[PDB]
Amino acid sequence: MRKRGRQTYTRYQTLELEKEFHFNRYLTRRRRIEIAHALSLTERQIKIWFQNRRMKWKKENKTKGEPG
Numbered sequence: 001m002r003k004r005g006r007q008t009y010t011r012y013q014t015l016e017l018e019k020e021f022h023f024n025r026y027l028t029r030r031r032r033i034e035i036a037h038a039l040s041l042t043e044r045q046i047k048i049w050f051q052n053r054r055m056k057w058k059k060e061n062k063t064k065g066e067p068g
Contacts, residue, residue, distance in 0.1 A: 009049065013039055017046070021053045 009017070016039055020027070027035070027050060032043045039046075 008045070013041065014049075017049055017053070021050065025054050025057070026050075 016035070020035060027046075029043070032046055035041070035046055036043060
């Protein structure tokens, strides 16, 4: 048995991805490849995580939460 959590990501991975999102809310192919070369991942998975990062951002930029 094992199952530490429901995440496909890792600490270090998420750290860099978070720094990188703090650096830029978008990344192009070449950059994403660089991240994948530095981090050992796939442009897809990274794009999805990145997508989710700003997904929550645009759903948490003082816009959600209708008290009236």
